[PDB]
Every structure is written in C-alpha cells, then in structure tokens.
C-alpha cells in the first residue's frame, strides 16, 4: 500500500546525485541538499544523476515513483489534477495522468500497478557517455505542488529504484521535489527557515 523510501544502495553502490544550480530568480530547476528537497518549475527539465561503485547487469532498470511525504497522505495516489490530466500536451508515451516523465529517452515506459494503481516511469541502465563520469536522467513534473484536485499543496517525495530485469530491488534512494514557479527563491526561503 506504500513503497519503500529506505535509502538502499544495494551491491552496486547505487546513489543519486544532483548538479549545483544556484538559487537565482531564473532558476529553472535547484536541489537543495540540506533539505534533499529539489526545487523545479512546471515541466521543465530536471537532470538528476545515477552512480554505481560497480558495473550492473545488462537488462537492470531505472524506476521513479512519486508518493506523497505526510503520513495522513502516504497511501494516496500521486496523480495529475483534473485541470492537467486533461490538458491534451501528451509526448506521445507519457499517460497524461503521470506526474513524472522522462525526457528523451524512446525507451521509457510508463506503468500503471494493476494492483496500487499507482504510476511509474522506468529506463534502461545505461553506461555514462565517453567522457563522463555519471548516467543523467531528465525529469519533467508535470503539475505543480499547488495544483488544486491533486497534490493540492502536499509534499511528495520522488522514490528512484535500480531494479534488474524483473523488477526485484537493486538499489534505493529518494528526495523530496516542489513544483513551483519560483525555484531559487522558494529554496533560499526554505533553507532560511531550516537554520532559524
Ligand atoms: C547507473 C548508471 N551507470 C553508471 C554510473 C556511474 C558509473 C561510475 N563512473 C565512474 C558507472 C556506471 C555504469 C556502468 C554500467 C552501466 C550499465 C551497463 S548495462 C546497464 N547498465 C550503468 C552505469
Ligand atoms: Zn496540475
């Protein structure tokens, strides 16, 4: 009824991590590592990093899954509001109910749990391009934190699992996410407030 959050990282050493984007006006995306909050804008392109200690196996997988953070909420399905799920800009793969999708990868496919009905995106592993040191993956969330009818203002938490090639747990890890039309300044606020 609710996935796991534990952080795991699993015989391969799996972890996130995020780029250093500052926390200026223009801001489009932010990860705010005192709070493991990412801050990001409606359907703008979010990188988030993959790393291993160790080389995993060809067919493992990439999933993300959003819950919701509280506990009154947690068993709650993270999906699109009723404005959006209904707002006809489809990328062709993505349902237009999921709140994650991934971007630019013809690979990605969607699940709906037959049983949680909850929603995921999930990818190939890959190894990092020649020359880098790191996998990317890139994110969009598609409604806002705010959005009325669905999350309504209620945190979630975007879960990463490093799956093989039935699904069975590699790794784990997870960070907080708000969709907002101001990043920087809603992270420069909220990073205020933690140390006072
Ligand atoms: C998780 C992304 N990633 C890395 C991230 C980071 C690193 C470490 N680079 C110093 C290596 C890899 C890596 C190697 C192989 C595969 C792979 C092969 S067949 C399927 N997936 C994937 C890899
Ligand atoms: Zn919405």
């Known amino acids: 009824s609710v ?3 534990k952080t795991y990282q699993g015989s391969y050493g799996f972890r996130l991590g995020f780029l250093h984007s500052g926390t200026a006006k223009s801001v489009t995306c932010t ?8 801050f990001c804008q409606l359907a703008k392109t979010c990188p988030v ?13 990439v999933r993300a899954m959003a819950i ?3 506990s009154q909420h947690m068993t709650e399905v993270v999906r699109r509001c009723p404005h959006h799920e209904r ?6 793969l993505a349902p237009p109910q999921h709140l994650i999708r991934v971007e630019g990868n013809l690979r990605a496919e969607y699940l709906d749990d037959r049983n949680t009905f909850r929603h995921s995106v999930v ?6 391009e020649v020359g880098s040191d790191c996998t990317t993956i890139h994110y969009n969330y598609m409604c806002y934190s705010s ?6 203002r209620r ?21 907080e996410v708000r969709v907002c039309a101001c990043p920087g300044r809603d992270r420069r606020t909220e990073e205020e407030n933690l140390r006072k």
């Open 68 to 70: 919701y953070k509280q």
């Open 147 to 152: 959005c009325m009818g669905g999350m309504n």
């Open 123 to 128: 990818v190939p592993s890959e190894p990092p």
């Open 49 to 61: 990093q993959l790393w291993v200690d160790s080389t995993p196996p060809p067919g493992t997988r």
């Open 87 to 92: 707002c006809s800009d489809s990328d062709g």
């Open 3 to 5: 996935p796991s959050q």
């Open 31 to 38: 990860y705010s590592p005192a709070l493991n909050k990412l």
């Open 155 to 175: 945190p979630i938490l975007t879960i990463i699992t490093l799956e093989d090639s039935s699904g069975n747990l590699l790794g784990r890890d997870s960070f």
